[PDB]
Symmetry: C3
Subunit: 304 residues, 3 copies
């Protein structure tokens, strides 16, 4: 209460998200500067289920800043009341947004959702950082994020899709959500409404469009992003949304391909796309590190 949390990426205003991106980018390039930013400070990091990516980037981020992360494998008020008088910051990877919200409710140090059924803001700072990084080096970033057309393909009733839509809205991107015309695979109306309100409120110039044909949705786009599809006959509804060569063939000449991982080479995309030349997946996953250092640093302090 009055402590700032990060339960979704829209916990940030547009300039805060753009500051975090640039800070991540400067910590990537100039780590020697940040080497004592969290000296003697600790992050308490709950995981209800392992994620190599999340755990290694978090634990490494703190070492690079000169502090330490407690890997804590799994009353909540009492727990939160008690850790907030010991640790400086907390991330938690819990099943539902409920447990995450409950913990944050009573916590008096910043709490960061390290993935739940409603968002994944650590990934969001990672991905938009990767997009700025990639396009800037190719000299395609004169128009900033504004000119980068983004498409998400696949199961779109999805915490990752929710948070990408929010990042795009915040950053003023054209976001296309390419999903099966099926109630169980589309973004939730609440999430669309949040996005259209944040673009309205900040006049970001962003837009949200829902396509039910990935090729039509991906025509002209600069980023194609997909993620894990995981009786298993979601496959019949999802298969037309596999990112393949014909899908990538309709995108811009500058396009890049992203997937937050774990990747399954014959589900959400073909091995030829992920292992092909438009794929930024591994550099994107490494960027979890630098985007984590930026987020922790910022919540450890708060400004700028």
């Amino acid at each position: 209460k009055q402590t700032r949390h990060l339960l979704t990426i829209s916990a940030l205003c547009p300039k805060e998200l753009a500051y975090l991106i640039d800070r991540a980018l400067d910590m990537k390039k100039n780590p020697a500067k940040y080497t004592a930013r969290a000296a003697n400070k600790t992050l308490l990091a709950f995981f209800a289920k392992p994620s190599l990516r999340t755990r290694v980037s978090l634990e490494t981020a703190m070492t690079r800043l000169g502090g330490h992360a407690i890997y804590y494998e799994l009353t909540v008020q009492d727990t939160a009341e008690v850790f907030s008088r010991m640790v400086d910051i907390c991330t938690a990877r819990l099943a539902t947004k409920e447990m995450m919200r409950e913990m944050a409710q009573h916590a008096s140090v910043p709490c960061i959702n390290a993935l739940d059924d409603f968002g994944h803001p650590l990934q969001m700072v990672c991905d938009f950082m990767t997009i700025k990084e990639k396009f800037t080096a190719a000299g395609e970033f004169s128009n900033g994020f504004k000119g980068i057309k983004f498409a998400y393909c696949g199961d779109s009733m999805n915490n990752v899709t929710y948070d990408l839509m929010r990042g795009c809205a915040l950053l003023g991107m054209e976001c296309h959500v390419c999903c099966p015309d099926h109630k169980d695979f589309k973004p939730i109306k609440e999430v669309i409404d949040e996005c259209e309100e944040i673009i309205a409120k900040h006049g970001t110039g962003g837009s949200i469009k829902i396509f039910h044909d990935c090729k039509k949705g991906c025509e002209g786009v600069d980023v194609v992003y997909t993620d894990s599809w995981m009786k298993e006959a979601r496959l019949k509804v999802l298969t037309p949304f596999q990112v393949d060569d014909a899908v990538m063939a309709v995108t811009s000449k500058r396009s890049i391909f992203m997937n937050c991982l774990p990747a399954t080479r014959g589900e959400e995309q073909t091995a030829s796309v992920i292992d092909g030349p438009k794929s930024v997946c591994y550099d994107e996953a490494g960027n979890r590190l630098h985007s984590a250092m930026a987020v922790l640093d910022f919540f450890l302090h708060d400004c700028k």
Copy 2:
């Protein structure tokens, strides 16, 4: 052998316990001074069962001192012989005092009992530190610990009660143990004898009194402390020892209420006491951190 351990709080003489309290208090207030006290030094921390409180305070304490704790989740001679040539200090949370004593026997670095069936000295430095802190800020500490009347309510055949009785004896406090007149719920004679001997030997001016009526036991007292009661018909014997509003109504006007946690709101106390205005429980649990830094620091060196 010839290495100093901390298996109970009476491993310390009265001035060492009072030094640890003041060091904890100064590390609370002035952490910047202690920031390199354990630089490059590691604590090996065994847990046979998780305790969020114990683990987070230990791991955080070392970071704050600039060192590191190995969270080690679970021959003992060979183990201890081997870790004593690698690590600088060791804490262990093991089932019985036996395993703890065995490990310490062969260990050649300091070993600290992080909770067993016979004591909890890390909690003891925490609690007496909290008592000094609270009463000092209220201006009720002119007579030091000497004037603070202390009462423990509940199941008193209990490692926590044992170690509170020892802390009180050491510090020269009037300690009242409020328990059911029942062989299975009273302090053990060995523990009473140790306490009466330490007060005798140091002329501490402390006293130990056993009451079988918590209200009678708590009349006039300045601290009321209870802890977890956990077929489950210990409840019929324990219920007259619940710390409720009528119990707290007989204590001093300055009194405070303590519980080392986990708290169960309708067992050892009512929700109105723990969530009411005399409760110091959460600040007390946070003080695990600073009392841990003091204990580790001291055993890492030894003097003063």
Copy 3:
């Protein structure tokens, strides 16, 4: 690919192994010098099964160098591709040489085998360091490793025996392998061939001899080393290779006894040998620490 790994000790040329030994020895004696060698740098440490020795020495080594180890309890390409853009170095304790080789294949930071079915190079730097240390203090090291006759007793189809044979070949020692004349308990021909080739290629002056009588094999030797034998009637084949008092009575007057641990007092050796006066086992196990700091430091950089 083009990243240097350490999957066996023969990943090192003879001078690199001798440099690591001397560095370990200088870090033992002068730790204050090495206190910022891994500042802000992290080691990712996978364990498919706990080893107190391996885990504590690794985690402590990094703290002493000023960095941090992630204890990671257990696609491999994707995993390795991803951790190589976050962490600085990796050790892994995996079942087979296969998984270890697979991980290393795709990894772009140094990977170190922390024990598999084919080697144990962290132990190797430990043991030869212990041998140099012990004999140097006794003034028995004028002839360096060259004059120290080494014998391994026991089950010799063994990753530890493999890597000792390699260390000896590298260092130019007479190595005697004392094993049961039984296909399942002898070194593998591939390992003998590697050793005879490394001595040939570097003209180390080392030799490999296979004895089927431990007393005959140990006659005159300066080091007797054994390790864990673990329906359980391997005991009938192994029992003539128990290191007992009559075995140690045939060695040099300067001899020492080694066992990498865990020790079972009535299997691979008698309690009188391991607890007797020739035993260096515990100082040897503590030396895991300093030999770990040397190996990590070296792979973190690479030269000298």
